[PDB]
Short mmCIF file of C-alpha atoms in Angstrom, two decimals:
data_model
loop_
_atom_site.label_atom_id
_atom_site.label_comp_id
_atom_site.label_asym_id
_atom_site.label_seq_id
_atom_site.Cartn_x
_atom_site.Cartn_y
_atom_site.Cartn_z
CA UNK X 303 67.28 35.74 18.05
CA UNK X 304 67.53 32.59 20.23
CA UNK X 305 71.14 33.35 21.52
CA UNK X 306 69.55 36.28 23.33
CA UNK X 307 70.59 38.94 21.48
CA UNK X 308 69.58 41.35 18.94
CA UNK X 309 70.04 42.47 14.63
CA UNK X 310 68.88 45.42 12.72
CA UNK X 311 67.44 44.35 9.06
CA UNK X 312 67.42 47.84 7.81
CA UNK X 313 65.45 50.72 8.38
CA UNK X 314 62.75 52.77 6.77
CA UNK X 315 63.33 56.14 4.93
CA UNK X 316 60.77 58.86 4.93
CA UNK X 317 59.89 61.74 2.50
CA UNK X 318 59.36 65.61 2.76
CA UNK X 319 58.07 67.52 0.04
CA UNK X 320 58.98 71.82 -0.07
CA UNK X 321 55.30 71.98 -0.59
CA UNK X 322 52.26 69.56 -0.14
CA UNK X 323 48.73 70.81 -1.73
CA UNK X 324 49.75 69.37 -4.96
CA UNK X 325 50.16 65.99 -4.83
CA UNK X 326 48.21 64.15 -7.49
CA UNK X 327 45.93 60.98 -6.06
CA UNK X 328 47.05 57.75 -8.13
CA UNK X 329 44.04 55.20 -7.39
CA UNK X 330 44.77 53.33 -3.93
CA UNK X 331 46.23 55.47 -1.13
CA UNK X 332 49.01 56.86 -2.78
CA UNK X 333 50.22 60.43 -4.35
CA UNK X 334 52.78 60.99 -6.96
CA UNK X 335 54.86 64.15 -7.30
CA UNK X 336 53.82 66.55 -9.89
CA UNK X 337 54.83 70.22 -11.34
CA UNK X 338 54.72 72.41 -8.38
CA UNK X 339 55.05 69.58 -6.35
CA UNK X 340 58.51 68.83 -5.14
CA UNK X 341 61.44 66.82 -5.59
CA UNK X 342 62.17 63.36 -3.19
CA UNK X 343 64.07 65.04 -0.05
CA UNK X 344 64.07 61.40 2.29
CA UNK X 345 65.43 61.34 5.25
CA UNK X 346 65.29 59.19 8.85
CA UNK X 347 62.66 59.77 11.05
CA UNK X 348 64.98 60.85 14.11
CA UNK X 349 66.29 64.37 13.43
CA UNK X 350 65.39 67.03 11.01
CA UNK X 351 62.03 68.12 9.61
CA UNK X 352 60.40 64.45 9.96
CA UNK S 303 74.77 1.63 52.62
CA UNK S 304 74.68 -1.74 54.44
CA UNK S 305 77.91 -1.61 56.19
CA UNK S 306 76.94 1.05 58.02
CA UNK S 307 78.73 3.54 55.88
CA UNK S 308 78.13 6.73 53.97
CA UNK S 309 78.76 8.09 49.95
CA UNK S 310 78.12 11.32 48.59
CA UNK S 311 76.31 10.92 45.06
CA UNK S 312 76.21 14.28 43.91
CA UNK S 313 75.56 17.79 44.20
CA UNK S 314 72.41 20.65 43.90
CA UNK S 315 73.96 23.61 42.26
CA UNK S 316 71.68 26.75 42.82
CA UNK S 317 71.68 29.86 40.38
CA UNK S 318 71.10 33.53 41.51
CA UNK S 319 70.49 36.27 38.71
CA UNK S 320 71.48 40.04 38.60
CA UNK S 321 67.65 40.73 38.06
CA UNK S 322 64.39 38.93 39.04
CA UNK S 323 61.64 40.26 36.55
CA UNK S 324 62.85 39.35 33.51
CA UNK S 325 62.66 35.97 33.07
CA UNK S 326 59.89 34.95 31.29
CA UNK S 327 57.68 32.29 32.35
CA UNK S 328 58.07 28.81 30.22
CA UNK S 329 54.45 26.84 30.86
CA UNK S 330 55.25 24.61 34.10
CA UNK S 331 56.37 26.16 37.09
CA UNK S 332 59.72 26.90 35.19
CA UNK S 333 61.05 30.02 34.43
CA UNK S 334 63.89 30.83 31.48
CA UNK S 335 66.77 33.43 31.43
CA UNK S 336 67.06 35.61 28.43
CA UNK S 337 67.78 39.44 27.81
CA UNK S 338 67.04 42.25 31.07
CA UNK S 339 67.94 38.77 33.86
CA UNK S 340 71.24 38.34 32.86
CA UNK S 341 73.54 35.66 32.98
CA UNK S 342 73.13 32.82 35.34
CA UNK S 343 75.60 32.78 38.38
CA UNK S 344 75.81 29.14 39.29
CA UNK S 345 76.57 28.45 42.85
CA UNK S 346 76.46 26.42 45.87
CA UNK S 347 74.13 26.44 48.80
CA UNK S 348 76.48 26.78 51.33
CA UNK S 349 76.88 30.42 51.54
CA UNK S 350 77.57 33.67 50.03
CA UNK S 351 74.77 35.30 48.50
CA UNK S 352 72.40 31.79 47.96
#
């Protein structure tokens, strides 16, 4: 900002899947999770698997 | 003045910064003080540090 200083708007999540190789292609450049896919698992991208 | 006398009219302060390399240059020969200079440390030219 002007008065020389600074704000965090937020900050963007991430995703690991237990298993990639199954991801089904939905048009653009995007997957979607499937069967024998995965459930969410987000995280940050500081610490942990990401 | 005519009288053969004197009058002080005023002042130059001076500023010094905690850190040169920081300020970021403003079009003329002008610099401005933001974030990594520090704060601006108005002073006299008489002595001390100026």
């Amino acid at each position: 900002y002007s008065n020389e200083q600074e704000q965090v708007l937020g900050q963007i999540v991430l995703a690991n899947f237990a298993n990639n190789e199954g991801l089904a292609s939905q048009g653009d450049n995007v997957w979607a999770a499937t069967q024998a896919s995965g459930v969410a698992l987000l995280g940050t991208a500081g610490s942990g698997n990401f």
